Amino acid sequence: AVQNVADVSVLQKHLRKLVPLLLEDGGEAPAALEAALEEKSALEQMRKFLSDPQVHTVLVERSTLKEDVGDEGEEEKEFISYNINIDIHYGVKSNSLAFIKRTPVIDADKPVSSQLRVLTLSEDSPYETLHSFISNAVAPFFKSYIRESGKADRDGDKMAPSVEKKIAELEMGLLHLQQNIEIPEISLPIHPMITNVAKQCYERGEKPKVTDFGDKVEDPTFLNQLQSGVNRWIREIQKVTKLDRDPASGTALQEISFWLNLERALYRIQEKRESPEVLLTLDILKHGKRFHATVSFDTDTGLKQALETVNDYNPLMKDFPLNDLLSATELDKIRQALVAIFTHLRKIRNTKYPIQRALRLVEAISRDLSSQLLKVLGTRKLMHVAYEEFEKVMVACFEVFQTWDDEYEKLQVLLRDIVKRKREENLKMVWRINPAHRKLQARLDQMRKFRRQHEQLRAVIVRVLRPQVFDAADANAIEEVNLAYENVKEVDGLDVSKEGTEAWEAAMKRYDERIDRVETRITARLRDQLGTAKNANEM
Amino acid sequence: AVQNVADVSVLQKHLRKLVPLLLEDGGEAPAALEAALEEKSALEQMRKFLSDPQVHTVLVERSTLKEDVGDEGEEEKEFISYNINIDIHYGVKSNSLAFIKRTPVIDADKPVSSQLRVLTLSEDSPYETLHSFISNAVAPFFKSYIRESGKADRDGDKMAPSVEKKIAELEMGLLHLQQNIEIPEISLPIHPMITNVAKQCYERGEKPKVTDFGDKVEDPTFL
């Protein structure tokens, strides 16, 4: 509710004590914070924040500014820059603190931190952060709250279980979190003095030497700065190298993009650390026997085993038929690409790959198929596709689907071959894969059925419905069947909604009620025309 | 990861200097936080949380307990206590501080506070808690970044608009989550000794009357 408006001093001191540890493991309320923190620009902002019972967002940041300095000797300078915002956004190269007022007006007499919750910003990957942290912060908490509150006990309100289900839908629906951000390389995050000195020592074309750095070649502080910069670079490249998109929650296109991305990134970083600057930095730090940095660089590459992990190039062997599929618009070329990609998947046998990842990618390929064949059938315009042409295009599509079903069975055989490999290590043996195109195909196949019967229902009208070939019921029933036919023809087509199939089923049971009316009429004509004899028109 | 691990002492002292600023709004560490320091189970759970990268979540629950009273007509007092939680739980009348590693790898040289992620919760209503906090935490920030980072111009992931609709329907459902106070029936407190005298004189098969308490019927402090 609305209460007394808190003062600047109490919360200012609170945040001043809280920040420096959370920001740089210390600092004890740095003066750069207090400079613009006490500024009227921030002061009136926070006065409005406390007073207005409508704003509950704020963002106090402290960017470690990378001040580019043009003076000769170094490239950049570390800087401190406190920033004030009333809205929350991704601060670049900084972590921020947000404060949400749980009470629309906050006072100091009640605890400010009790009526206001604290958030701290992530700069490395804010989206992955926020997702994983809200999951781990609410999903078990909300489950425990549901259990203790007995929401399952009172069935009058059943929306809390649904909101738990949709929280789960969020948490398992987006795992990529805009993964594969395509970070191929960065700048050199090491000591700038050495880099610049070596730059002028090499632009002269005289092979930068040990002595030209002066005492810095053996200075303990200079070598420590080199070690810190090398450690920062090695940590950054480790972070970028350990990135690996989850095979699920994505697509085959995402997988191939990630594969090519990591390939080119490792290609460029295996050519970047070989620059003379890095070599001379390592040499002159080891000159002072800085062996820890050397062994870290030797062991913290973290890319070699990844290099053999990507040394399989049958991935591209499959990717080429994947591009053929993405370019495919006709069924024959579609299962030609399927045959090719199956052959390449059989060829993957000689290489090493995570088998669960491979199975997930196979399922992703199956649903990518489902999607492209769906757009193909939509292109074929089945909404009013003619009878015989519907059957013909169905024969083509269904034989293509049977070819891909044979491919699926051969993939199961390849999975048995995988298990033949797997007796080398004997890990988990759980397999479950099912493309949903089945249901699509399900609808497909059932439509075929009505088409068949409708053909049978046409000629007999000229034959059995015609009077010995009454006229009134004859005309009535032909109008019945024709209007019901146009109804079941324009009611549903390339439509993929299964509830559309159910509505079609209702339409066809009305169809069949007219059919059975015709059956009763023709059988009545039968029986009233019977009783004479057996021969020909009698029976 | 485990290459360098922050010590128990440094992290525990950081929490000791951090908690009172939040759960007392700038106060000083109480005897509950002293127990938190000395709680061997907490002492081992924080070590497991800091070391094991399998779980990056820890929760400290400054609990309020219904302290029994002997006063002259004044209801039972509340005593501040502490609880440790590797996982997270629905705390009741017990404030909570959650610490989940923003940086999955654990390094003592890396600033531990800048290696961790700080959340907190006071028990007023989980419904409005989750709704308002997710709203003012993700809506402006998420839409601001997707609009400003050029992702709205990137077709690599149309995942973002779908999850925007997802966030919106979270906020809708959680704001409509305002139905029940959820206070159907609570235990009736009188006093321990009267209740146990009644139970012990009835379990024998006898009706409790004024006589069983004996002297307790005319004791002004007891009454």
PDB file of C-alpha atoms in Angstrom, chain B residues 38-212:
ATOM      1  CA  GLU B  38      28.212 -23.135  14.016  1.00  0.00           C
ATOM      2  CA  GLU B  39      25.627 -25.409  12.350  1.00  0.00           C
ATOM      3  CA  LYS B  40      27.693 -28.438  11.346  1.00  0.00           C
ATOM      4  CA  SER B  41      24.994 -29.622   8.939  1.00  0.00           C
ATOM      5  CA  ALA B  42      24.986 -26.166   7.344  1.00  0.00           C
ATOM      6  CA  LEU B  43      28.791 -26.172   7.523  1.00  0.00           C
ATOM      7  CA  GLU B  44      28.880 -29.324   5.374  1.00  0.00           C
ATOM      8  CA  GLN B  45      25.988 -28.367   3.081  1.00  0.00           C
ATOM      9  CA  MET B  46      27.639 -25.077   2.119  1.00  0.00           C
ATOM     10  CA  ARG B  47      30.852 -26.990   1.383  1.00  0.00           C
ATOM     11  CA  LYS B  48      28.933 -29.427  -0.828  1.00  0.00           C
ATOM     12  CA  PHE B  49      27.233 -26.529  -2.621  1.00  0.00           C
ATOM     13  CA  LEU B  50      30.505 -24.665  -3.188  1.00  0.00           C
ATOM     14  CA  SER B  51      32.417 -27.758  -4.317  1.00  0.00           C
ATOM     15  CA  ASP B  52      29.905 -29.765  -6.348  1.00  0.00           C
ATOM     16  CA  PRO B  53      29.089 -28.170  -9.732  1.00  0.00           C
ATOM     17  CA  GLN B  54      26.200 -30.609 -10.224  1.00  0.00           C
ATOM     18  CA  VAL B  55      24.029 -28.384  -8.009  1.00  0.00           C
ATOM     19  CA  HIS B  56      24.654 -24.631  -8.075  1.00  0.00           C
ATOM     20  CA  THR B  57      21.805 -23.688  -5.707  1.00  0.00           C
ATOM     21  CA  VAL B  58      21.874 -23.085  -1.955  1.00  0.00           C
ATOM     22  CA  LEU B  59      19.261 -21.597   0.358  1.00  0.00           C
ATOM     23  CA  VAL B  60      19.555 -20.194   3.881  1.00  0.00           C
ATOM     24  CA  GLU B  61      16.260 -19.909   5.759  1.00  0.00           C
ATOM     25  CA  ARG B  62      16.252 -17.485   8.680  1.00  0.00           C
ATOM     26  CA  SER B  63      13.327 -19.128  10.439  1.00  0.00           C
ATOM     27  CA  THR B  64      10.880 -17.675  12.948  1.00  0.00           C
ATOM     28  CA  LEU B  65       9.720 -20.193  15.555  1.00  0.00           C
ATOM     29  CA  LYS B  66       6.613 -19.992  17.734  1.00  0.00           C
ATOM     30  CA  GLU B  67       8.488 -19.584  21.015  1.00  0.00           C
ATOM     31  CA  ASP B  68       6.405 -20.703  23.985  1.00  0.00           C
ATOM     32  CA  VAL B  69       5.331 -17.993  26.416  1.00  0.00           C
ATOM     33  CA  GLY B  70       4.705 -17.813  30.143  1.00  0.00           C
ATOM     34  CA  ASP B  71       3.656 -14.174  30.249  1.00  0.00           C
ATOM     35  CA  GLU B  72       0.555 -12.677  31.868  1.00  0.00           C
ATOM     36  CA  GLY B  73      -1.957 -12.791  29.034  1.00  0.00           C
ATOM     37  CA  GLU B  74       0.496 -12.138  26.176  1.00  0.00           C
ATOM     38  CA  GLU B  75       0.468 -14.510  23.199  1.00  0.00           C
ATOM     39  CA  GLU B  76       3.417 -16.737  22.351  1.00  0.00           C
ATOM     40  CA  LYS B  77       6.616 -14.934  21.384  1.00  0.00           C
ATOM     41  CA  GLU B  78       8.531 -15.388  18.129  1.00  0.00           C
ATOM     42  CA  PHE B  79      12.170 -16.523  18.186  1.00  0.00           C
ATOM     43  CA  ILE B  80      14.532 -15.888  15.274  1.00  0.00           C
ATOM     44  CA  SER B  81      16.323 -19.031  14.078  1.00  0.00           C
ATOM     45  CA  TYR B  82      18.177 -20.299  11.006  1.00  0.00           C
ATOM     46  CA  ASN B  83      17.801 -23.082   8.454  1.00  0.00           C
ATOM     47  CA  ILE B  84      20.064 -24.385   5.687  1.00  0.00           C
ATOM     48  CA  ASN B  85      18.714 -25.715   2.391  1.00  0.00           C
ATOM     49  CA  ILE B  86      20.718 -27.222  -0.463  1.00  0.00           C
ATOM     50  CA  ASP B  87      17.473 -27.225  -2.440  1.00  0.00           C
ATOM     51  CA  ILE B  88      14.722 -24.608  -2.161  1.00  0.00           C
ATOM     52  CA  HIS B  89      11.574 -25.134  -0.124  1.00  0.00           C
ATOM     53  CA  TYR B  90       8.317 -23.341   0.574  1.00  0.00           C
ATOM     54  CA  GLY B  91       9.385 -21.522   3.712  1.00  0.00           C
ATOM     55  CA  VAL B  92       6.553 -20.501   6.026  1.00  0.00           C
ATOM     56  CA  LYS B  93       6.977 -17.607   8.491  1.00  0.00           C
ATOM     57  CA  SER B  94      10.693 -17.972   7.714  1.00  0.00           C
ATOM     58  CA  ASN B  95      12.597 -15.562   5.477  1.00  0.00           C
ATOM     59  CA  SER B  96      14.843 -17.025   2.796  1.00  0.00           C
ATOM     60  CA  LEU B  97      18.002 -16.047   0.927  1.00  0.00           C
ATOM     61  CA  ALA B  98      18.910 -18.071  -2.162  1.00  0.00           C
ATOM     62  CA  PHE B  99      22.399 -18.126  -3.666  1.00  0.00           C
ATOM     63  CA  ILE B 100      22.759 -19.763  -7.086  1.00  0.00           C
ATOM     64  CA  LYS B 101      26.075 -19.624  -8.936  1.00  0.00           C
ATOM     65  CA  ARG B 102      25.983 -17.158 -11.824  1.00  0.00           C
ATOM     66  CA  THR B 103      29.354 -18.614 -12.839  1.00  0.00           C
ATOM     67  CA  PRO B 104      29.065 -22.434 -12.923  1.00  0.00           C
ATOM     68  CA  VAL B 105      32.795 -22.932 -12.354  1.00  0.00           C
ATOM     69  CA  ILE B 106      33.925 -22.318  -8.771  1.00  0.00           C
ATOM     70  CA  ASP B 107      37.118 -20.333  -8.186  1.00  0.00           C
ATOM     71  CA  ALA B 108      38.396 -18.691  -5.012  1.00  0.00           C
ATOM     72  CA  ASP B 109      40.375 -16.173  -7.077  1.00  0.00           C
ATOM     73  CA  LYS B 110      37.188 -15.366  -8.970  1.00  0.00           C
ATOM     74  CA  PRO B 111      35.117 -13.028  -6.749  1.00  0.00           C
ATOM     75  CA  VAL B 112      32.756 -15.438  -4.994  1.00  0.00           C
ATOM     76  CA  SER B 113      30.066 -12.781  -4.591  1.00  0.00           C
ATOM     77  CA  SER B 114      30.592 -11.952  -8.273  1.00  0.00           C
ATOM     78  CA  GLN B 115      30.594 -15.721  -8.871  1.00  0.00           C
ATOM     79  CA  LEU B 116      27.209 -16.097  -7.133  1.00  0.00           C
ATOM     80  CA  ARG B 117      23.667 -14.915  -7.830  1.00  0.00           C
ATOM     81  CA  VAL B 118      21.595 -13.472  -4.985  1.00  0.00           C
ATOM     82  CA  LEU B 119      17.834 -13.870  -4.595  1.00  0.00           C
ATOM     83  CA  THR B 120      15.681 -13.436  -1.507  1.00  0.00           C
ATOM     84  CA  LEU B 121      12.106 -13.900  -0.334  1.00  0.00           C
ATOM     85  CA  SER B 122       9.913 -12.776   2.557  1.00  0.00           C
ATOM     86  CA  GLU B 123       6.738 -14.735   3.270  1.00  0.00           C
ATOM     87  CA  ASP B 124       3.756 -12.556   2.402  1.00  0.00           C
ATOM     88  CA  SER B 125       2.171 -14.387  -0.555  1.00  0.00           C
ATOM     89  CA  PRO B 126       3.932 -16.655  -3.088  1.00  0.00           C
ATOM     90  CA  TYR B 127       1.239 -15.780  -5.639  1.00  0.00           C
ATOM     91  CA  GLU B 128       1.925 -12.050  -5.865  1.00  0.00           C
ATOM     92  CA  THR B 129       5.585 -12.792  -5.075  1.00  0.00           C
ATOM     93  CA  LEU B 130       6.156 -14.808  -8.233  1.00  0.00           C
ATOM     94  CA  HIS B 131       3.838 -12.722 -10.407  1.00  0.00           C
ATOM     95  CA  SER B 132       5.236  -9.274  -9.620  1.00  0.00           C
ATOM     96  CA  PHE B 133       8.853 -10.409  -9.426  1.00  0.00           C
ATOM     97  CA  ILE B 134       8.820 -12.211 -12.770  1.00  0.00           C
ATOM     98  CA  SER B 135       6.957  -9.279 -14.341  1.00  0.00           C
ATOM     99  CA  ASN B 136       9.303  -6.508 -13.229  1.00  0.00           C
ATOM    100  CA  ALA B 137      12.331  -8.818 -13.645  1.00  0.00           C
ATOM    101  CA  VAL B 138      11.897 -10.229 -17.157  1.00  0.00           C
ATOM    102  CA  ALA B 139       9.370  -8.089 -19.078  1.00  0.00           C
ATOM    103  CA  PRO B 140      11.316  -4.803 -19.441  1.00  0.00           C
ATOM    104  CA  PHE B 141      14.741  -6.450 -19.459  1.00  0.00           C
ATOM    105  CA  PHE B 142      13.887  -9.237 -21.915  1.00  0.00           C
ATOM    106  CA  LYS B 143      12.026  -7.051 -24.407  1.00  0.00           C
ATOM    107  CA  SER B 144      14.680  -4.334 -24.103  1.00  0.00           C
ATOM    108  CA  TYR B 145      17.502  -6.736 -24.933  1.00  0.00           C
ATOM    109  CA  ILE B 146      15.711  -8.516 -27.786  1.00  0.00           C
ATOM    110  CA  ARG B 147      14.794  -5.169 -29.348  1.00  0.00           C
ATOM    111  CA  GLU B 148      18.195  -3.531 -28.786  1.00  0.00           C
ATOM    112  CA  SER B 149      20.603  -6.427 -29.431  1.00  0.00           C
ATOM    113  CA  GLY B 150      19.401  -6.822 -33.019  1.00  0.00           C
ATOM    114  CA  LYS B 151      17.819 -10.204 -32.283  1.00  0.00           C
ATOM    115  CA  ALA B 152      14.508  -8.823 -33.561  1.00  0.00           C
ATOM    116  CA  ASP B 153      16.398  -8.380 -36.852  1.00  0.00           C
ATOM    117  CA  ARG B 154      17.800 -11.939 -36.664  1.00  0.00           C
ATOM    118  CA  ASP B 155      15.734 -14.826 -38.037  1.00  0.00           C
ATOM    119  CA  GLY B 156      18.017 -17.517 -36.601  1.00  0.00           C
ATOM    120  CA  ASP B 157      15.643 -17.982 -33.651  1.00  0.00           C
ATOM    121  CA  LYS B 158      11.959 -17.086 -33.892  1.00  0.00           C
ATOM    122  CA  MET B 159      11.984 -18.744 -30.469  1.00  0.00           C
ATOM    123  CA  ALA B 160      11.989 -15.290 -28.847  1.00  0.00           C
ATOM    124  CA  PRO B 161       8.461 -14.129 -29.871  1.00  0.00           C
ATOM    125  CA  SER B 162       7.000 -17.485 -28.850  1.00  0.00           C
ATOM    126  CA  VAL B 163       8.605 -17.236 -25.428  1.00  0.00           C
ATOM    127  CA  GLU B 164       7.417 -13.612 -25.204  1.00  0.00           C
ATOM    128  CA  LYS B 165       3.847 -14.861 -25.563  1.00  0.00           C
ATOM    129  CA  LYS B 166       4.749 -17.543 -23.024  1.00  0.00           C
ATOM    130  CA  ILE B 167       5.970 -14.889 -20.561  1.00  0.00           C
ATOM    131  CA  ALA B 168       2.808 -12.854 -21.115  1.00  0.00           C
ATOM    132  CA  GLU B 169       0.590 -15.828 -20.314  1.00  0.00           C
ATOM    133  CA  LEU B 170       2.671 -16.552 -17.199  1.00  0.00           C
ATOM    134  CA  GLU B 171       1.982 -13.002 -16.054  1.00  0.00           C
ATOM    135  CA  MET B 172      -1.722 -13.349 -16.872  1.00  0.00           C
ATOM    136  CA  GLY B 173      -2.126 -16.605 -14.963  1.00  0.00           C
ATOM    137  CA  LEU B 174      -0.088 -15.419 -11.991  1.00  0.00           C
ATOM    138  CA  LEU B 175      -1.959 -12.112 -11.706  1.00  0.00           C
ATOM    139  CA  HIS B 176      -5.248 -14.016 -11.838  1.00  0.00           C
ATOM    140  CA  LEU B 177      -3.663 -16.226  -9.138  1.00  0.00           C
ATOM    141  CA  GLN B 178      -5.341 -14.231  -6.371  1.00  0.00           C
ATOM    142  CA  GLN B 179      -8.216 -16.472  -5.318  1.00  0.00           C
ATOM    143  CA  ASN B 180      -7.858 -18.077  -1.896  1.00  0.00           C
ATOM    144  CA  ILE B 181      -6.411 -16.876   1.398  1.00  0.00           C
ATOM    145  CA  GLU B 182      -5.719 -20.579   2.128  1.00  0.00           C
ATOM    146  CA  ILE B 183      -6.463 -20.441   5.857  1.00  0.00           C
ATOM    147  CA  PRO B 184      -9.085 -23.203   6.302  1.00  0.00           C
ATOM    148  CA  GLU B 185      -8.239 -24.402   9.815  1.00  0.00           C
ATOM    149  CA  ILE B 186      -5.271 -23.921  12.151  1.00  0.00           C
ATOM    150  CA  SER B 187      -4.264 -25.727  15.340  1.00  0.00           C
ATOM    151  CA  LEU B 188      -5.899 -24.432  18.518  1.00  0.00           C
ATOM    152  CA  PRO B 189      -3.230 -23.439  21.082  1.00  0.00           C
ATOM    153  CA  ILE B 190      -3.992 -23.261  24.804  1.00  0.00           C
ATOM    154  CA  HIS B 191      -0.849 -24.352  26.682  1.00  0.00           C
ATOM    155  CA  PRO B 192       1.277 -27.546  26.802  1.00  0.00           C
ATOM    156  CA  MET B 193       0.722 -28.682  30.398  1.00  0.00           C
ATOM    157  CA  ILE B 194      -3.078 -28.391  30.416  1.00  0.00           C
ATOM    158  CA  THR B 195      -3.303 -30.330  27.148  1.00  0.00           C
ATOM    159  CA  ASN B 196      -0.968 -33.111  28.258  1.00  0.00           C
ATOM    160  CA  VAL B 197      -2.732 -33.413  31.625  1.00  0.00           C
ATOM    161  CA  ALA B 198      -6.041 -33.805  29.792  1.00  0.00           C
ATOM    162  CA  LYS B 199      -4.569 -36.404  27.427  1.00  0.00           C
ATOM    163  CA  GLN B 200      -2.843 -38.376  30.194  1.00  0.00           C
ATOM    164  CA  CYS B 201      -5.958 -38.413  32.380  1.00  0.00           C
ATOM    165  CA  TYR B 202      -8.175 -39.399  29.439  1.00  0.00           C
ATOM    166  CA  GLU B 203      -6.027 -42.143  27.876  1.00  0.00           C
ATOM    167  CA  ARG B 204      -6.622 -44.187  31.038  1.00  0.00           C
ATOM    168  CA  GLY B 205     -10.313 -44.084  30.108  1.00  0.00           C
ATOM    169  CA  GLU B 206     -11.494 -41.290  32.419  1.00  0.00           C
ATOM    170  CA  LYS B 207     -13.263 -38.019  31.670  1.00  0.00           C
ATOM    171  CA  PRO B 208     -11.079 -34.947  32.334  1.00  0.00           C
ATOM    172  CA  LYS B 209     -12.563 -32.499  34.838  1.00  0.00           C
ATOM    173  CA  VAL B 210     -11.336 -29.582  36.967  1.00  0.00           C
ATOM    174  CA  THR B 211      -9.756 -32.009  39.452  1.00  0.00           C
ATOM    175  CA  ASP B 212      -7.021 -33.470  37.226  1.00  0.00           C
TER     176      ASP B 212
END
